[PDB]
Amino acid sequence: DPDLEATLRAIVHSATSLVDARYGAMEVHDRQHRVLHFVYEGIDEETVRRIGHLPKGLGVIGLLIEDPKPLRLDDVSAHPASIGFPPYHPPMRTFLGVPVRVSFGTLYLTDKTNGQPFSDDDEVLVQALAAAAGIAVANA
């Protein structure tokens, strides 16, 4: 649906630019937790091709899907639910993930470019953007 995905991309781009994240993404899933939409920013096509397949919603991704609550991490790979990055996936450290809610999905940002953890303010802002995304999906 060209509607929703233009909007979801715009929302991801705004979140990423507003909190100075190097990477940003959003997954939307059905109530069976199968990923329906995956939108992303900050990774070029050549790298996407190397990774080769879309996230299935595992590790910390799957964690946010099954228990949709905001999560900020200094190091996502140190979370005990972490599964690891697949081959050619850029390594990422700092992490901010918030549910797309009215819960249909997750908005997540990584590697704030100052090397610092994401802030409280960052989380409030991105949560509002995810809420906006929730409205867009719910109404699509």
Annotated binding site for heme: 89
Instruction: Look up residue 96 and give its two tokens.
Output: 């901010």
Q: Which residues of 56-74 are buried (b: 16+ CB within 10 A; e: fewer)?
A: ebebbbbbbbeebebbbbe
Q: Show Cβ contacts of residue 77 under 8 Å, excluding neighbours closer than 6 positions.
A: 84, 85, 91, 92, 93
> Measuring CA to CA, which residue among 85, 103, 90, 76 is closest to residue 43?
90
- From the list a copy of itself, ligand HEM, none, which binds 61 (C-beta under 5 to 8 Å, kind-based)? ligand HEM
Q: How far is the CB of 134 from ligand HEM (least distance, A)?
A: 19
Q: How far is the CB of 63 from a copy of itself (least distance, A)?
A: 23
Contact call for residue 51 and a copy of itself (CB under 8 A): no
- Select the residue interacting with ligand HEM from 23, 96, 107, 137 (CB under 6 A): 23
Contact call for residue 54 and ligand HEM (CB under 6 A): yes
Contact call for residue 133 and a copy of itself (CB under 8 A): yes
Instruction: Look up residue 26 and give its two tokens.
Output: 């959003």
Contact call for residue 78 and a copy of itself (CB under 8 A): no
> Measuring CA to CA, which residue among 1, 21, 3, 2 is closest to residue 107?
21
Contact call for residue 24 and a copy of itself (CB under 8 A): no
Site residues (vs a copy of itself, CB under 8 A): 2-4, 6-7, 10-11, 14-15, 17-18, 102, 121, 124-125, 127-129, 131-136, 138-140
